[PDB]
A paper describes a structure:
Herpesviruses cause severe diseases particularly in immunocompromised patients. Recent symmetry-relaxed cryo-EM reconstruction strategies of α- and γ-herpesviral virions provided first snapshots of the unique portal vertex that is essential for DNA encapsidation and release. These studies revealed for the first time a pentameric cap on top of the portal that presumably seals the capsids against DNA leakage after packaging and has been proposed to consist of pUL25 in HSV-1 and its ortholog pORF19 in KSHV. Here, we report the crystal structures of the CTDs of pUL25 orthologs from 3 members of the β- and γ-herpesviruses (HCMV, KSHV, and murid gammaherpesvirus 68 (MuHV-68)), highlighting their structural conservation across the herpesvirus subfamilies.
Similar to HSV-1 pUL25CTD, pUL77CTD and pORF19MCTD crystallized as a monomer. Pentameric portal caps have been demonstrated in α- and γ-herpesviruses; however, neither HSV-1 pUL25CTD nor MuHV-68 pORF19MCTD are pentameric in solution or in the crystal, suggesting that additional triggers or stabilizing forces are required for pentamerization. The crystal structure of the HSV-1 pUL25 CTD displays a remarkable charge distribution with a number of positively charged residues on one face of the molecule (blue in S4A Fig) and a cluster of negatively charged residues on the opposite face. A similar but more pronounced polarization in the electrostatic potential was observed in pUL77CTD, whereas the corresponding surfaces of the γ-herpesviral orthologs did not reveal any accumulation of charged residues. (E) View on the MuHV-68 pORF19 CTD (pORF19MCTD) shown in surface representation with residues conserved across all 4 orthologs colored in yellow.
Numbering used by the authors: 105 to 344, 351 to 365, 384 to 449, 453 to 516
The structure:
């Protein structure tokens, strides 16, 4: 079933089957003798280095790659890889999508701070997202004064040990985990305070059922939800005169900012596609996270990141007759988690993100930032000569 989304106020509405950028990209190849789409600096270097890789799939080597453009197959493949970064590759009854885990965590916190009832279904869980994020961003400043946003990891595997728990110190130095603990959330058998009701479990039991265990007992949903929540906070901070993206020129003359995006893009997407993962909602945010995964934006650090991503992309798009593939998916996901924590640890997350998005993706204002987050690229028309 097709559904409708609007990304920016006053802008046209789009009817999509699953992904907005996947709906847009084919429309940019209907005037190939007049113009081709150009996707920006990071995309041109990525395409250029992919055309030099020995193992690079031949199906993604179209002529457009050499005309300051990308072939439709290559931009589609890249959009797919980025959208699948935070997607669970396995089936597990205990697992929620990262998006739903973040939504349960943020609704529990909002309920505890305002002494208001918990949501009991999907539409209530999707309500007042802007106020929930606003409360979380203002309260988080207190917790982030002495704590960072990166996990204390042991191995590059994403899942916890048999039993459901990570190492005792895994979440210890995380500001968002600490903020939830100060509010009485995620209590355990060894917690020092008199335990309050587990509001996250009451939400999961009501909306999803009995298969979702407590986040403190089966900690994969907590690791997953915390990083999806960091992505929503980074989106809030990024959106808080001339533009690169011109829809009239690309598609035809017929074609707060955060709150509008929530109500007209995020909420309609999750009502029609409830399992949508965070990197599929906001692929551009995951590219920004990948760019800051080393904790630096120097061309040396950017180059090393770009080499690492191109090798990962290469493995993910291979068609050759599986542990190497799993390792690559996990490595890309962990690099984005690291990048996300790094951005939030910077003095001004919004400024750091704005500097990166302007240099690597040529976004010029809030209009371009929102579209970059949803599409993963900001295409421009380039004349064919």
């Amino acid at each position: 079933g097709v559904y409708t989304v609007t990304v920016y106020p006053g802008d046209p509405a789009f009817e999509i089957q699953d992904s907005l950028p996947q709906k847009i990209w084919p429309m940019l190849y209907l005037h190939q003798q007049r113009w081709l789409p150009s996707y920006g600096p990071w995309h041109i270097r990525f395409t250029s280095s992919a055309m030099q890789l020995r193992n690079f799939p031949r199906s993604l080597r179209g002529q457009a790659n050499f005309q300051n453009s990308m072939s439709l197959k290559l931009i589609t493949a890249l959009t797919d890889v980025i959208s699948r970064i935070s997607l669970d590759f396995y089936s597990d009854l205990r697992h929620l999508s990262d998006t739903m885990s973040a939504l349960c965590l943020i609704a529990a916190y909002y309920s505890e701070k305002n002494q208001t009832p918990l949501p009991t279904n999907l539409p209530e869980l999707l309500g007042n997202i802007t106020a929930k994020v606003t409360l979380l961003v203002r309260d988080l400043k207190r917790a982030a004064a002495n704590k960072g946003f990166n996990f204390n990891r042991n191995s590059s595997s994403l899942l916890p040990a048999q039993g459901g728990l990570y190492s005792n110190d895994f979440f210890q130095e995380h500001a968002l985990y600490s903020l939830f603990r100060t509010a009485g959330m995620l209590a355990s058998s060894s917690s020092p305070e008199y335990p309050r009701a587990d509001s996250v479990l009451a939400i999961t039991a009501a909306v999803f059922g009995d298969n979702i265990p407590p986040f403190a007992a089966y900690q994969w949903n907590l690791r997953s939800g915390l990083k999806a929540l960091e992505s929503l906070i980074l989106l809030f901070l990024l959106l808080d005169s001339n533009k690169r993206l011109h829809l009239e020129a690309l598609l035809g003359e017929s074609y707060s900012v955060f709150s509008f995006l929530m109500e007209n893009y995020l909420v309609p997407t999750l009502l029609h596609r409830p399992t949508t993962n965070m990197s599929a909602l906001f692929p551009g945010l995951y590219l920004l996270q990948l760019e800051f995964s080393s904790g630096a934006s120097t061309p040396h650090a950017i180059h090393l990141t770009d080499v690492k991503f191109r090798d990962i992309f290469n493995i993910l798009v291979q068609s050759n007759v599986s542990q190497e593939l799993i390792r690559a998916k996990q490595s890309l996901r962990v690099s984005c988690e690291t990048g996300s924590g790094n951005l939030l640890e910077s003095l001004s997350p919004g400024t750091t993100m704005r500097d990166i998005i302007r240099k690597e993706f040529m976004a010029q204002d809030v209009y371009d930032y929102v579209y970059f987050c949803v599409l993963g690229a900001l295409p421009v028309t380039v004349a064919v000569v």
